[PDB]
């Protein structure tokens, strides 16, 4: 079941040694444990999620989200509704 609340940034997007990105998100909604809504948009990209299907284990919990973002300009959407978090990423 999908999370339906506010997800704030705990630690910002960062490139890893193994050429991937990681975000650490705090979940501020209810219904937790729940699947974290993750969208990778281009300038909708499929199967670029490295992490094992991310979940918000409890409210106030932090979650590591490993992605393989496309080259260049990409947009990561964490969550749903007007509380969704759109993140702009650039990959060289």
């Amino acid at each position: 079941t999908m999370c339906s609340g506010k997800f704030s940034i705990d630690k910002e997007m960062a490139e890893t040694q193994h050429g991937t990105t990681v975000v650490k998100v705090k979940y501020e909604g209810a219904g937790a444990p729940c699947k974290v809504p993750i969208e990778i948009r281009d300038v909708k990209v499929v199967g670029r999620i490295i992490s094992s299907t991310p979940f918000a284990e409890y409210t106030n919990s932090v979650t590591n989200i490993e992605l393989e973002p496309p080259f260049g300009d990409s947009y990561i959407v964490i969550g749903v509704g007007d509380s969704a978090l759109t993140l702009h990423w650039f990959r060289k």
């Epitope: 960062a14 193994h18 490295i50």
Partner: antibody, heavy 117, light 108 residues
Framework: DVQLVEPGAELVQPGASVKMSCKAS????????INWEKQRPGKGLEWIGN????????NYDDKFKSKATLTIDTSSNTAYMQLSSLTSEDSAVYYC??????????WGQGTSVTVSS | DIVMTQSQKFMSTSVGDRVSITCKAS??????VAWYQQKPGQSPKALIY???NRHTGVPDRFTGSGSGTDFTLTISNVQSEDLADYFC?????????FGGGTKLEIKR
């Protein structure tokens, strides 16, 4: 010519903390990740975690979260690992290495830490 | 966490013979597998990067093969200097995990 200079050995008291250095040279330091590994005698290798000079980006292996602190001094091209509240489980050979998407390539000489009063 | 299973703990080979050091991944790590040579009382030396690619200044005796879960390091024409500890490492995802190690003995 890549060179990661690591002090040979360090004698630490139980419960005390140690700061060990890894002096890089021979390459663009601020453009490669630094790795740190643990090697207990007759036992295998363990990945402590990694640092990125050109951003200060850190990744730790949860096993070492409360134990290791990875700092970097770009002005001295030295990478550091601080191990805290030492126990005999911490007596091991600590390595530092250059990182990339090819991983470890050039390993330093390793500090042989010994925990005893 | 991914577990690198280097089953071969000890291996004896006469100079000139062929040896195949196996490594098994707990899950699909793709090709993000490196091999290292650790000669007694020395730092590990990088041999193979990304499962099959030999590093600079590594003899063509050293060969890497495989993908996913089965990875092998092959040393054809064994030399007296080849006397070391050999290990695989995954860098597919954090935390980076190492093979058990394989102490290669040289038969004489």
């Amino acid at each position: 010519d890549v060179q990661l200079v690591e002090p040979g050995a360090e004698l630490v008291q139980p419960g005390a903390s140690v700061k060990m250095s890894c002096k890089a040279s021979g390459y663009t330091f601020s453009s490669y990740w630094i790795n740190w590994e643990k090697q207990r005698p007759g036992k295998g290798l363990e990945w402590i975690g990694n640092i990125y000079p050109g951003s200060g980006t850190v990744n730790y292996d949860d096993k070492f979260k409360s134990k290791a602190t990875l700092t970097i001094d770009t002005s001295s091209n030295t990478a550091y690992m601080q191990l805290s509240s030492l126990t005999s489980e911490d007596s091991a050979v600590y390595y530092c290495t250059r990182g990339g998407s090819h991983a470890m390539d050039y390993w330093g000489q390793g500090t042989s830490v010994t925990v005893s009063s | 966490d991914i577990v690198m299973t280097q089953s071969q703990k000890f291996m004896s080979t006469s100079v000139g013979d062929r040896v195949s050091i196996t490594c098994k991944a707990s899950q699909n790590v793709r090709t993000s597998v490196a091999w290292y040579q650790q000669k007694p009382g020395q730092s590990p030396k990088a041999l193979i990067y990304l499962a099959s690619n030999r590093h600079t200044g590594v003899p063509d005796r050293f060969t890497g093969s495989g993908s996913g879960t089965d990875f092998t390091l092959t040393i054809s024409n064994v030399q007296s200097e080849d006397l070391a500890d050999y290990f695989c490492l995954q860098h597919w995802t954090y935390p980076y995990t190492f093979g058990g190690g394989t102490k290669l003995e040289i038969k004489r």
